[PDB]
Amino acid sequence: MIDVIIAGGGPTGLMLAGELRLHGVRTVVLEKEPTPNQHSRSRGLHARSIEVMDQRGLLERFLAHGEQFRVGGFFAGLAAEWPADLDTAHSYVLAIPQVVTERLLTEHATELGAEIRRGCEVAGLDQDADGVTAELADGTRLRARYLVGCDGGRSTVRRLLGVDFPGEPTRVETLLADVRIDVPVETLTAVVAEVRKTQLRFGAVPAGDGFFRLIVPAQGLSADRAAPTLDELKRCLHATAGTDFGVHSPRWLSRFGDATRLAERYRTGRVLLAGDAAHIHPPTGGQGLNLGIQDAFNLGWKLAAAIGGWAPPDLLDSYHDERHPVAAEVLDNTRAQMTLLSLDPGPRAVRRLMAELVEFPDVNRHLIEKITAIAVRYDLGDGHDLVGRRLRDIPLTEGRLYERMRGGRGLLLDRTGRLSVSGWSDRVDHLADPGAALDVPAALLRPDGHVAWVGEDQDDLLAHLPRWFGAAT
């Protein structure tokens, strides 16, 4: 029997598939497209995702396929420098196109034994006390214990579950086009800089083969929501830039709206949602793929614990509880960034103010910690300030913390010489290293790297172990 079916083999589904396979969960990914999508949305990973890749031994291959940037501009285009003191060992943006990210994640899930089935479109579902059935559009059916809808912003699974998707509708649309041009790049660049004085929803990024990615505001809102024609792209370039640059030969035409919507329940019985299936928002700040990877990283070890039979009874519900608030904050911060890009005089004045404020290092750091997700803190109810936050990478006596996390178990980082995870050692590794560079006596880490407990008293540690790791054996 299949343990988990994943509907959708985008970055979220593929990441989830890898996390599940770490625990020997039998995982089948049903991806509707017969061949990988060739057009990239995402342009890169942010620090929390880069950390996550390094905790799973994937960072070397991501670095080998991308370029590291430390530049300003990630929060609503607000120019700065990169913050000097961001609290991560991975303080950069990894520019890497989404197609490449999906290739790396695909090759990793496949090598861990996930079964990826392309050309398989989930059309229907049926669940009961014991499992879930997925019905494919070709009439075939698959049974598993759980089903996770990782099937993007127009998720079939979300619709079939009848999960509400409340939020703000699209009010502002933007065109995206991969096109050739008929002006020299220096001419394109000169005009773009003049426009971007005021309209920051505009630009042109070379693909390095003579094509350019043009971003240009739409005129109004479209009834269809269909992709724009070349004719509409030209009208929009004329309106914003005063020229269409002789654009021709499009190889991709797209439109995106600024709606911010969040699934009301991430879990419905044995079916969950993750990634764009659970939340949509503007690309301002480059956050969605990152958010989805982190959804998968939250969910995977929990679902694995439930399949393994040791998950405490509330564990799976803690996926919604922790991740739904996080997405709500991304959605809000993208509403704020879109307002900072508005040409209306009030917003332009607020933008000038924000430009003054981001010269303060605390502000610049705050906005980038927000964007890059390194300061996410779940409410795991304790006082100690580290509890609920992920722990950054730190040097050990030999090596580093993230090197020890590649199995995806919990980890007790113990500097006291005195604690013990006996009873849970099959689920929690004991990293007994007084030399570790972390100024607490000990920290219990969940498999997602978030701190569940900080302290130095064995009895207290025994009290917190079952919450995340179930019963002693």
Add this chain to the structure above:
Amino acid sequence: MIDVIIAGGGPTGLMLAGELRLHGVRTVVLEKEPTPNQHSRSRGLHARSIEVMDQRGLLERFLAHGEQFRVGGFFAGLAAEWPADLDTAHSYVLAIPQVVTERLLTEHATELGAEIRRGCEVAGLDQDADGVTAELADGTRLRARYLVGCDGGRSTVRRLLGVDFPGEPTRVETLLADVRIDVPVETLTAVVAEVRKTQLRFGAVPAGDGFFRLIVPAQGLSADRAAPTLDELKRCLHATAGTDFGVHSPRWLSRFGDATRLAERYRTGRVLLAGDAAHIHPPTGGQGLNLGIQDAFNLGWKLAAAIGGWAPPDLLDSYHDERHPVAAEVLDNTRAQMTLLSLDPGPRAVRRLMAELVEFPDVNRHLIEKITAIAVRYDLGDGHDLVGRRLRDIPLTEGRLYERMRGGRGLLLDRTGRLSVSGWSDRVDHLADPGAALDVPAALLRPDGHVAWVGEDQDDLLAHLPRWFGAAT
């Protein structure tokens, strides 16, 4: 002959009148209303104005008539605490009603010998190479050397000069009403707090005689711009608060718009503009009266120098040059604050972000330094960071710096034991005090307290003296 006619005896005109009388300028204020206005707009003075009053020996009487506050909320209502480290010796808001401010300024101008003429409405003007004629609406005429329009936001003088008043039109109107209510104050307070969760353009402030000042958004924009009726106030209270509180017996009804307009030229020959006559904007942050007092404080000693015959040829033009940019920044910051009060979801998201940022002390300080005008810096072209800024009050060996400024002359604060203002001592006092708590060798202060020069070399000091103080005698 009259030296200066001031059109308008509001706070700006009255302050200007006092500054001029310090120098024996013959000053006549033509105020159109026969009796003082009884309704207050302004609720208080900000730190730069409080400093200015203390440099002119008026602070004791302002403090005796007002209440000192150190509370958050002055930038778009963003709750904080008052910033701990604001760079002023006068770190507070002086709550004092505008009527009282005008009384104090009137009694001060009158005691210095300004001639205030109430019931005198400027209707027309005529200037030539030698002077200006003001024509009053009763057909009488007065001649002076200069005329300053201090005649408010619908300035007659600005209109007669044909000075453009460009900017953003009113898009958002607010009602103001001094009314009695028919609910207990605790009920009023409870509803206002519920509304102010989201609508911060709403409130109710007791006058202490059973009347309340109610602030409530208008519905739309009015064609007349006329004062609202009680009926319109009720409609607006119902819409915003769900109740009109039984408001009755209005003693004042007003409406104000959010237009931001700035006179294109502060000076037209022998006629200048100051105060609301030169700029209008929202009351967000409580800045207009303050800005006007500071306009007068910039202009007065300069006009006095021109009347006295020693002003360098560019001096009077430096009023426009210095003060026009300052007003432009107030106008912009009020556009930003109004946006932060908008109920639209984008602005609400930007407001939540700003609420996070103002917890950083640098941000809170930055916004309050902006509001209170203490960080205004004129471009007087040097490098030294103090040049162009006002100098805060500082302790002397005995006493304090602001105690020595009450004559309204320049002031060389010299710690070196070696400098000299000989040649200019009738215009610049030499405060030779190595014990003064200021970490520069010496600072030359203009009569408005702004630093013209910092250094320690007599020859260099001689080079900068004529720019502000004319030729040696």
